[PDB]
Design an enzyme around this catalytic site. Structure first.
Site, mmCIF file in Angstrom:
data_model
loop_
_atom_site.group_PDB
_atom_site.id
_atom_site.type_symbol
_atom_site.label_atom_id
_atom_site.label_comp_id
_atom_site.label_asym_id
_atom_site.label_seq_id
_atom_site.Cartn_x
_atom_site.Cartn_y
_atom_site.Cartn_z
ATOM 1 N N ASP A 191 0.895 -1.193 0.000
ATOM 2 C CA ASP A 191 0.000 0.000 0.000
ATOM 3 C C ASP A 191 0.923 1.230 0.000
ATOM 4 O O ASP A 191 1.524 1.520 1.057
ATOM 5 C CB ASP A 191 -0.993 -0.030 1.171
ATOM 6 N N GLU B 88 1.690 2.056 13.355
ATOM 7 C CA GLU B 88 0.531 1.992 12.435
ATOM 8 C C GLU B 88 -0.465 1.045 13.086
ATOM 9 O O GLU B 88 -0.506 -0.152 12.803
ATOM 10 C CB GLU B 88 0.988 1.621 11.022
ATOM 11 N N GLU C 20 -9.724 -3.768 15.698
ATOM 12 C CA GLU C 20 -8.571 -4.596 16.161
ATOM 13 C C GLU C 20 -8.060 -4.083 17.511
ATOM 14 O O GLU C 20 -7.236 -4.774 18.121
ATOM 15 C CB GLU C 20 -7.454 -4.654 15.111
ATOM 16 N N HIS D 216 -6.010 0.155 1.621
ATOM 17 C CA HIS D 216 -6.463 -1.153 2.167
ATOM 18 C C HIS D 216 -7.525 -0.955 3.258
ATOM 19 O O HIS D 216 -8.125 -1.955 3.675
ATOM 20 C CB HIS D 216 -5.251 -1.942 2.694
HETATM 21 C C1 LIG Z 1 -2.784 -2.315 6.091
HETATM 22 C C2 LIG Z 1 -3.550 -1.334 6.781
HETATM 23 C C3 LIG Z 1 -4.816 -1.912 7.365
HETATM 24 C C4 LIG Z 1 -6.004 -1.784 6.661
HETATM 25 C C5 LIG Z 1 -7.158 -2.310 7.198
HETATM 26 N N1 LIG Z 1 -7.201 -2.947 8.370
HETATM 27 C C6 LIG Z 1 -6.053 -3.055 9.038
HETATM 28 C C7 LIG Z 1 -4.839 -2.573 8.596
HETATM 29 C C8 LIG Z 1 -3.601 -2.757 9.436
HETATM 30 N N2 LIG Z 1 -3.299 -1.572 10.250
HETATM 31 C C9 LIG Z 1 -2.753 -1.937 11.556
HETATM 32 C C10 LIG Z 1 -3.796 -2.415 12.542
HETATM 33 C C11 LIG Z 1 -3.138 -2.937 13.872
HETATM 34 C C12 LIG Z 1 -2.801 -4.421 13.824
HETATM 35 S S1 LIG Z 1 -1.567 -4.965 15.051
HETATM 36 C C13 LIG Z 1 -0.052 -4.156 14.470
HETATM 37 C C14 LIG Z 1 1.168 -4.964 14.876
HETATM 38 O O1 LIG Z 1 1.149 -5.034 16.320
HETATM 39 C C15 LIG Z 1 1.511 -6.331 16.722
HETATM 40 N N3 LIG Z 1 0.970 -6.511 18.068
HETATM 41 C C16 LIG Z 1 -0.337 -6.829 18.419
HETATM 42 C C17 LIG Z 1 -0.540 -6.595 19.741
HETATM 43 C C18 LIG Z 1 0.712 -6.112 20.268
HETATM 44 C C19 LIG Z 1 1.216 -5.647 21.501
HETATM 45 N N4 LIG Z 1 0.500 -5.676 22.627
HETATM 46 N N5 LIG Z 1 2.501 -5.223 21.572
HETATM 47 C C20 LIG Z 1 3.261 -5.313 20.481
HETATM 48 N N6 LIG Z 1 2.923 -5.757 19.269
HETATM 49 C C21 LIG Z 1 1.631 -6.113 19.203
HETATM 50 C C22 LIG Z 1 0.967 -7.245 15.632
HETATM 51 O O2 LIG Z 1 1.596 -8.522 15.680
HETATM 52 C C23 LIG Z 1 1.305 -6.416 14.375
HETATM 53 O O3 LIG Z 1 2.626 -6.722 13.916
#
Ligand SMILES: CCc1ccncc1CNCCCCSC[C@H]1O[C@@H](n2ccc3c(N)ncnc32)[C@H](O)[C@@H]1O
Ligand SMILES: CCc1ccncc1CNCCCCSC[C@H]1O[C@@H](n2ccc3c(N)ncnc32)[C@H](O)[C@@H]1O
Lengths: 326, 328
Positions: free
Chosen positions: B17, B109, B118, B266
C-alpha cells in the site's frame, strides 16, 4: 463461531450439489431411516435431521457444539417435530445420548476431505452406533495425481521477489526472500484446473467410516507410484475426494473431482519445492504423509522421485494457511 | 492476530500500500528534527519498516516492539541493513516488556477499519508510560468522519440475502421462524468497500481522538454525537465512515487520509446500514449517536441511533465489526 453464522449455514444450505446430494442419499435409502434412531453429528441449522425425518426416522439426535444449536431448536419447534428431533447443544464427545442409534449422518468434509478434523468427531460418535449400524457418508475416497502448471509454480517467485530489492523505501529486504518463498510454498492452493494439466491417472486412498477409528486420522500415509501418461515438468500433486452413501437401496456419490461440476470444496494443489522432469512411461514414486496438527488441520509431508532418473523433490505444507486462488 | 501479522505475505500486502508506506515515510523524513539524535519507540513494528524510516531520519536509538514471530524477521533485516547499533527489536507485548529508557517519540501503524477495529490504539496509548514529558506521537490525532449516504443497490443486496430465511418450504423445511435473526445478522455486518462521493447526502461530521492526551481506558467506550444539515432529499440507507491521521511534527503536519475523495487504501471505507432507511429533505437535520463499546473479540459493539429532527423519523442498527462484509 464461523459455522455459528446464519449466513454460513445459508451458503451450505444454498449449495445444491451438497444439500441436494444429501437429500437424495437419504430419501432414496428410506429403508435405512424408516422408524430408525438417527445421530446427526454437527447438525448446524439441522437440515440433515429434517431430511432423516422426511425419510421416516422415529428419533433423531442432532448435536451441535456452536450457538447454531439454538437456531436449530427454533426450526424443530417451528416445524412441529419436537417429538422426533431432539437438539443436543455441545460437543459429540461430551454430550449424553439416551440410547444407541441405527445410523449416523454428518457433513464433516473439509478441503481435501480431512481439513478441519471433523471426521474425528464423526468416527468418535460410533461409540453410539449399534453393532451393524450404518454411516452416511459410509466411505471417503481421496484422489491424488501429479500436475504440470508452470504459471502457478513461477507466480510463487513473482510474489516472493517483492523481498529481493536493495532499496524498498531505502530498506534492503533481500535477507527475507528465502523465508518468503518457503512461506508461499507451505500454502496449499485451493482452486480448480483443466483436467489436461494432470500427468497421470489418480491414486485413490479410501477411508471406510464403518471400520476406521478416530486415531486412524491423526497420521494418514498415502504411498503413490504414478505411471506418467505425459512428458513434462511435474510441479506438484492435485487432491480431490468423493464420498459414498452406501444404503440398503443404493449407493449415492458426492464427487469433488475436476471431472465434475465445480463444488465449494474446489480441489487442492500442493507444489513441489523443485519440479521433476518425467517422460511418458516414467514412474513417479513417493509418499504423502498427513499429520494432524494443533490448528484443526494437517501438516502435509510429500516426497517424490522420478524412478528412472533418481531426480527427487519434497515439500512440507500447512493446510491451515491455504491460498484461495479461484 | 499474532499469527495473521506473523505472515511475510501479510507484511508485503501492507508495505505494498504505497499511500500507507509513502505517507509514513514522508511524515517521518520531512520531520527529521523530531527524530535526529532522539530515542524512538515503534509499537507493533512488524517487519520493522517504520523503525528503518526513523533510522533514516537520524534516530540515536529505536526500540522496535513486536508480539508476533515477525520480530525474528525484523531482527534479520536490522543485521542485513547494518543498523544493529541503532534499531533494537524487543520481542513481546508493549504492555509486558522493559525498555532501558524513556523515549522522545512513539511511532505505530495501529489503525483498523473505521480507525478503531482490532483495538491496537489501546496498546499505542499504553506505550505512553515510556514517553518523556514533551514527547510526541506519530500519528498524533485521528479524525473519524461520518456522513449519511443513499444506496438502494446495497440495501437490497442484503435483503436479497436475509429473505432466504423467509422460505416456508426449503427442501420441505420451514425457515421463516429465523427471518428476524437472519435480517439482524446481515444488517449487523459493516460493509467494507469504496463508493462514489455523490451517494453522500451531507457534509461529514468529524470526531477527533488526540493520541497525545487520550488514555488507554478512553477507548473502551467511544460516544460520537452527530448533527447533519442535509444537502439532498432522499432515503438515508446508513452512515459512511472514514478516517484521517495527522503526524503533527515540528516541521510540518502530514496527513494520511482514507477519505473517499482520496486514492483508495487497504482501509477502503465502512458503511453501517439502517434496517429501515430514513426519508429526509434538503435542509432537514439528521442527529443521533454512534456508540462504540470494546468487546472480548478485539473489536467493538457499534450502536447507531439517527433521527430526522423535523419528523421524529428514527432508525437504529447494532453492528458487529467482528463480521465485516468485504464487498470490493
Ligand atoms: C494495512 C492497513 C490496514 C487496513 C485495514 N485494516 C487493518 C490494517 C492494518 N493496520 C494496523 C492495525 C493494527 C494491527 S496490530 C499491528 C502490529 O502489532 C503487533 N501486536 C499486536 C498486539 C501487540 C502488543 N500488545 N505489543 C506489540 N505488538 C503487538 C501485531 O503482531 C502487528 O505486527
Ligand atoms: C470449507 C469446506 C466446505 C466446503 C463446502 N461446503 C461445506 C464445507 C464444510 N463442510 C463441513 C466441514 C466440517 C466443519 S464442522 C461441522 C459442524 O460441526 C460443528 N461442530 C464442531 C465441532 C463439534 C463437535 N465436537 N461436536 C459437535 N458439533 C461440532 C460445527 O459448529 C459445524 O456446525
Amino acid at each position: 463461531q464461523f459455522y455459528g453464522y446464519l449466513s454460513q449455514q445459508q451458503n451450505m444450505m444454498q449449495d445444491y450439489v451438497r444439500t441436494g446430494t444429501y437429500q437424495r442419499a437419504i430419501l432414496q435409502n428410506h429403508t435405512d431411516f424408516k422408524d430408525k434412531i438417527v445421530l446427526d453429528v454437527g447438525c448446524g441449522s439441522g437440515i440433515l435431521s429434517f431430511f432423516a425425518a422426511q425419510a421416516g426416522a422415529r428419533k433423531i439426535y442432532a448435536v451441535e457444539a456452536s450457538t447454531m444449536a439454538q437456531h436449530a431448536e427454533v426450526l424443530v419447534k417451528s416445524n412441529n417435530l419436537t417429538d422426533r428431533i431432539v437438539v443436543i447443544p455441545g460437543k459429540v464427545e461430551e454430550v449424553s445420548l439416551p440410547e444407541q442409534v441405527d445410523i449416523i449422518i454428518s457433513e464433516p468434509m473439509g478441503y481435501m476431505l480431512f481439513n478441519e478434523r471433523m471426521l474425528e468427531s464423526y468416527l468418535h460418535a460410533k461409540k453410539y452406533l449399534k453393532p451393524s449400524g450404518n454411516m452416511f457418508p459410509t466411505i471417503g475416497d481421496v484422489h491424488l495425481a501429479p500436475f504440470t502448471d508452470e504459471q502457478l509454480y513461477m507466480e510463487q517467485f513473482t510474489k516472493a521477489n517483492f523481498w529481493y530489492q536493495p532499496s524498498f523505501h531505502g530498506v534492503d529486504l533481500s535477507a527475507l526472500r528465502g523465508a518468503a518463498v518457503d512461506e508461499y510454498f507451505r500454502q496449499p492452493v485451493v482452486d480448480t484446473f483443466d483436467i489436461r494439466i494432470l500427468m497421470a491417472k489418480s491414486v485413490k486412498y479410501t477411508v471406510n467410516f464403518l471400520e476406521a477409528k478416530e486415531g486412524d486420522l491423526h497420521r494418514i500415509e498415502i504411498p503413490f507410484k504414478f505411471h506418467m501418461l505425459h512428458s513434462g515438468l511435474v510441479h506438484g500433486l492435485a487432491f480431490w475426494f468423493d464420498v459414498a452413501f452406501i444404503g440398503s437401496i443404493m449407493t449415492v456419490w458426492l464427487s469433488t473431482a475436476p471431472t465434475e461440476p465445480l463444488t465449494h470444496w474446489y480441489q487442492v494443489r500442493c507444489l513441489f519445492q523443485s519440479p521433476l522432469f518425467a517422460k511418458a512411461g516414467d514412474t513417479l514414486s513417493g509418499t504423502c504423509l498427513l499429520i494432524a496438527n494443533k490448528r484443526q488441520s494437517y501438516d502435509i509431508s510429500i516426497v517424490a522421485q522420478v524412478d528412472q532418473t533418481g531426480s527427487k523433490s519434497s515439500n512440507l505444507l500447512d493446510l491451515k494457511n491455504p491460498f484461495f486462488r479461484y
